[PDB]
Design an enzyme around this catalytic site. Structure first.
Site, PDB file in Angstrom:
ATOM      1  N   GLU A  41       0.903  -1.145   0.131  1.00 47.89           N
ATOM      2  CA  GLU A  41      -0.056  -0.034   0.006  1.00 47.89           C
ATOM      3  C   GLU A  41       0.899   1.311  -0.153  1.00 47.89           C
ATOM      4  O   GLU A  41       2.018   1.320   0.525  1.00 47.89           O
ATOM      5  CB  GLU A  41      -0.974   0.032   1.346  1.00 47.89           C
ATOM      6  CG  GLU A  41      -1.624   1.456   1.434  1.00 47.89           C
ATOM      7  CD  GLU A  41      -2.419   1.286   2.720  1.00 47.89           C
ATOM      8  OE1 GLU A  41      -2.191   0.613   3.470  1.00 47.89           O
ATOM      9  OE2 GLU A  41      -3.431   2.175   2.755  1.00 47.89           O
ATOM     10  N   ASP A 106       9.338   6.410  15.216  1.00 51.01           N
ATOM     11  CA  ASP A 106       9.366   7.734  14.850  1.00 51.01           C
ATOM     12  C   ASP A 106       9.774   8.710  16.189  1.00 51.01           C
ATOM     13  O   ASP A 106       9.220   8.464  17.129  1.00 51.01           O
ATOM     14  CB  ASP A 106       8.156   8.190  14.413  1.00 51.01           C
ATOM     15  CG  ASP A 106       8.086   9.700  13.803  1.00 51.01           C
ATOM     16  OD1 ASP A 106       9.263  10.342  13.571  1.00 51.01           O
ATOM     17  OD2 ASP A 106       6.949  10.075  13.578  1.00 51.01           O
ATOM     18  N   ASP A 108      10.854  12.405  17.310  1.00 48.78           N
ATOM     19  CA  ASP A 108      10.810  13.883  17.125  1.00 48.78           C
ATOM     20  C   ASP A 108      11.255  14.744  18.033  1.00 48.78           C
ATOM     21  O   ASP A 108      11.500  14.316  19.442  1.00 48.78           O
ATOM     22  CB  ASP A 108       9.105  14.407  16.680  1.00 48.78           C
ATOM     23  CG  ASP A 108       9.460  15.501  15.818  1.00 48.78           C
ATOM     24  OD1 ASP A 108       9.649  16.757  16.220  1.00 48.78           O
ATOM     25  OD2 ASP A 108       9.140  15.540  14.553  1.00 48.78           O
TER      26      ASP A 108
END
Ligand code: SF4
Lengths: 397, 450
Positions: A41, A106, A108
């Site tokens: 996808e 992830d 940040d």
């Protein structure tokens, strides 16, 4: 206001600069096209704000042509499905079952702004990038020594973060429960509120103790001098004091710093110990010393341990920004990260265009080293995939 | 198989006092042995389930079950008959509960908890022998990783085995063995940081993983047994016992005092419903009359007082003449007491036989209210019994799951401070009432000497 790349800039980047072949070979896990790519996808984000999911490409040329024709601001990588996602409209919603996706992490800067002073808001520099660097160091430590993962790479998020892509066959095939388990193993700092003591479980887990030992030499150099966040008395009261366990010690330190304003972070760090020694006397002093050391270690972890985004890792169906994508606001290329990487080293798309104007070849631009690094990573991943296939065949016999 | 060969196989199987029940028992057992062993293991599992539904601590459940072990299923004995009892009972219950998914889940949960308790009651040497009987790490590998393993397992040791002193923890750790397995099989222990991880392998809390493997294997074997059951359906002999076992999971007293509040506080809700119907309508249909009559006989009401009770209840409205009562009803009431026909002393109906009833229609008051009453109506009377909203919610949650007997025990406990029989409910309430009366009399006597 430095305007982001224009639509024509994105067309140029996609037509001449994107390493489409290397990304295709990375995600295909085979030199020949397979269902790992046909059934993957892909979600595409447009400048108008439109978001189109369930895109799939059968080949290298199809991928490049579709991306060029769409010209999205960015596109995100999904999981392998049992059927081509691009054919979703002909399928019942229950027929598209995710089967494989790379383990993703992830990180940040957003969770560290309470402890940095070299930058404000959405800014980033080499000084604050040490937080992300230590985060990758600890995460790679865990992934390598505890989980046995070998084929993982970090990629710049574009502005102030980094994404981890674990491509091990074992990591790729993990169910959502297993992904949650690995995340909970790595996500030590579950409560990100700085106004409350962590009170981490004692004794430390060996991963937690190892991370503490790895982070201890950097705590002074970063927090107490380079960032110096507790020089401000209000910031000290807001973030340093709540990590302590004793109310009397907190009140004494508050009064002392009110009487002696603007003591630097190192001075306050030493004052904590001095006042605690002055206060806690008698046969019970050892327990107080141990608890103060525990609180100091908890603050070291709170301030330097990786603070992962927990959503992106939990489920196999989660989408994450593909590498080498252009950050719409900064124009930085989401390049892979090495040990020497800093945010200022990420090439900008306009600079790449300026280089290509002089030399109409991608191999002569600043993007090339990152492409070479990614190509080497893909080659190693393919070699390990062949080794795993051989091992599976041997085990079946 | 020769008796001697059978004993040899059974001894090879029991080399440890604990088993995964991997291989089917071989040999012949009598029907009395079949049913008795099945019912004994079923009682043990039902007590486990009742303890679990009450959120009892593991130590309390162990303490409750130990006498039941000594009575029904002796463990840690060298007798071959007790081991045969355990093995055959387990496989009979596998035959019983393989029919439906919910039965399978209940059976595997209860059996896994029983496994946990039995493993906890074993000696450390026996536990080591059982786990040896899943690759153990060499002593060198343990020595290299000793610091990390001890750091991981110290908290587990302190909190599970109550080894508060560090020296005892280290001494145990020196003897403890570790198993190296992929972390994917022990992700549950990985989440709570109870197991050490290195290079994708988890170093083992062993009881939890052993229980998980046992539950998985038991689930699979139950599925296979369910697939093979229709071939066993040809045995006319075992089917009734299996059906019964599977469904089994689901002058002070005279004609006047049975209506009194002193005796009326003790009945279970079914009996209160039947008596309220009798008082309101001056008549109870066949099943309700049978349930009420057998209860009343079981609580001490003699035959003559039963006849007086029934005649007075039926003739109160004038719609029934004494002649009609003697013509139609007297024979049945005497028969219930074993005074007519074959003189069979009918036993009072337990909860299961009441539930086997055919569902009460309009005008019926028999059956079990917790199964046969609407949720609003049950909430109404449970409020009438001065139960709090949380207690009512718990009882209704028990009723929704089909655990009507559990809810009966629950209402008993809240109103007074595992029941499967109305006479048992009445007897426990009566004993508590007499104990409370004696305590009050003692308090009154003590307060009169100052
Ligand atoms: S659970 Fe049994 S004793 Fe209680 S009300 Fe229902 S049928 Fe009567």
């Amino acid at each position: 206001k430095t305007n982001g790349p224009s639509s024509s800039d994105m067309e140029y980047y996609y037509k001449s600069l994107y390493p489409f072949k290397h990304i295709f070979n990375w995600l295909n896990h085979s030199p020949k096209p397979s269902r790992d790519m046909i059934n993957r996808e892909f979600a595409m984000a447009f400048r108008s704000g439109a978001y189109k999911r369930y895109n799939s490409f059968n080949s290298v040329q199809d991928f490049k042509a579709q991306i060029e024709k769409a010209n999205p601001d960015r596109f995100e990588i999904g999981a392998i499905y049992n059927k081509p996602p691009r054919e979703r409209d002909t399928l019942l919603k229950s027929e598209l079952k995710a089967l494989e996706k790379e383990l993703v992490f992830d990180i940040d800067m957003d969770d560290y702004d309470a402890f940095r002073t070299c930058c404000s808001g959405a800014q980033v520099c080499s000084k604050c990038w040490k937080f992300i660097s230590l985060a990758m160091k600890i995460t790679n430590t865990a992934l390598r020594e505890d989980f046995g993962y070998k084929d993982f790479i970090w990629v710049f998020s574009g502005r102030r973060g980094a994404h981890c892509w674990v491509s091990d066959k074992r990591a790729r095939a993990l169910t959502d429960v297993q992904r949650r388990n690995v995340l909970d193993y790595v996500n030590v700092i579950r409560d990100r509120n700085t106004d409350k003591r962590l009170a981490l479980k004692r004794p430390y887990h060996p991963h937690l103790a190892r991370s503490l030992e790895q982070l201890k030499p950097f705590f002074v150099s970063i927090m107490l001098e380079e960032q110096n966040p507790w020089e401000d008395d209000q910031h000290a009261i807001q973030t340093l004091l709540p990590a302590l366990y004793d109310k009397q010690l907190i009140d004494s330190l508050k009064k002392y710093w009110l009487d002696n304003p603007r003591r630097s972070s190192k001075e306050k760090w030493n004052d904590i110990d001095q006042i605690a020694t002055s206060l806690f006397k008698g046969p019970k002093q050892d327990s107080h010393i141990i608890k103060l050391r525990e609180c100091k270690e908890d603050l070291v972890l709170m301030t330097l341990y990786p603070k992962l985004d927990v959503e992106v890792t939990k489920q196999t169906i989660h989408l994450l920004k593909a590498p080498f994508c252009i950050h719409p606001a900064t124009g930085n290329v989401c390049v892979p990260i090495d040990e020497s990487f800093a945010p200022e080293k990420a090439p900008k798309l306009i600079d790449l265009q300026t280089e290509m104007e002089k030399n109409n070849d991608v191999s002569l631009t600043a993007l090339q080293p990152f492409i070479n690094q990614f190509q080497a990573y893909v080659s190693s991943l393919l070699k390990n995939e062949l080794g795993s296939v051989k091992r599976e065949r041997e085990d079946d016999d | 198989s020769s008796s001697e060969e059978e004993k040899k196989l059974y001894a090879r199987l029991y080399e440890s006092k604990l088993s995964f029940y991997d291989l089917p028992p071989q040999g012949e057992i009598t029907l009395e042995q079949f049913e008795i062993w099945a019912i004994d293991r079923l009682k043990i599992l039902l007590e486990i389930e009742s303890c679990l539904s009450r959120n009892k601590s593991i130590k309390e459940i162990e303490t409750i079950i130990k006498p039941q072990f000594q009575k029904l299923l002796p463990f840690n004995t060298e007798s071959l008959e007790d081991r045969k009892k355990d093995y055959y009972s387990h496989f009979i219950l596998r035959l019983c509960f393989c029919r439906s998914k919910e039965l399978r889940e209940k059976f595997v949960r209860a059996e896994t908890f029983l496994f946990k308790i039995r493993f906890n009651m074993l000696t450390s040497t026996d536990q080591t022998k059982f786990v040896q009987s899943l690759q153990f790490i060499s002593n060198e590998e343990k020595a290299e990783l000793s610091h990390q393993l001890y750091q991981t397992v110290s908290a587990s040791l302190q909190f599970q085995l109550n080894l508060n002193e560090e020296h005892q923890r280290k001494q145990y750790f020196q003897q403890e063995k570790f198993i190296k397995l992929p972390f994917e099989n022990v992700i549950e222990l990985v989440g709570n940081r109870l197991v050490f991880l290195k290079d994708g392998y988890a170093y083992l809390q062993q009881l939890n993983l052993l229980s998980n493997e046992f539950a998985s294997k038991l689930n699979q074997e139950l599925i296979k047994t369910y697939q093979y059951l229709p071939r066993l359906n040809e045995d006319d002999r075992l089917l009734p016992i299996l059906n019964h076992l599977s469904s089994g999971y689901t002058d002070e007293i005279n004609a006047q005092s049975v209506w009194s509040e002193e005796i009326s506080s003790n009945y279970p809700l079914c009996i209160k419903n039947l008596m309220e119907g009798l008082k309101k309508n001056h008549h109870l249909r066949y099943y309700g009359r049978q349930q009420l009559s057998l209860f009343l006989k079981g609580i001490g009401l003699s035959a003559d007082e039963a006849l007086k009770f029934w005649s007075e209840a039926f003739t109160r409205n004038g719609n029934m003449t004494m002649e009609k009562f003697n013509k139609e009803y007297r024979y049945s009431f005497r028969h219930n007491y074993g005074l007519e026909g074959n003189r069979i002393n009918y036993k009072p109906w337990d909860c299961h036989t009441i539930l086997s009833k055919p569902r009460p229609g309009r005008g019926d008051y028999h059956g079990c209210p917790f199964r046969d009453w609407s949720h609003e109506r049950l909430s109404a009377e449970l409020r009438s019994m001065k139960l709090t909203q949380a207690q009512i919610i718990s009882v209704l949650d028990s009723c929704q799951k089909g655990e009507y007997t559990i809810a009966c025990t629950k209402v008993f406990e809240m109103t007074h401070n595992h029941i499967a029989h109305p006479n048992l409910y009445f007897e426990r309430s009566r004993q508590l009432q007499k104990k409370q009366q004696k305590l009050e009399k003692e308090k009154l006597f003590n307060n009169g000497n100052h």
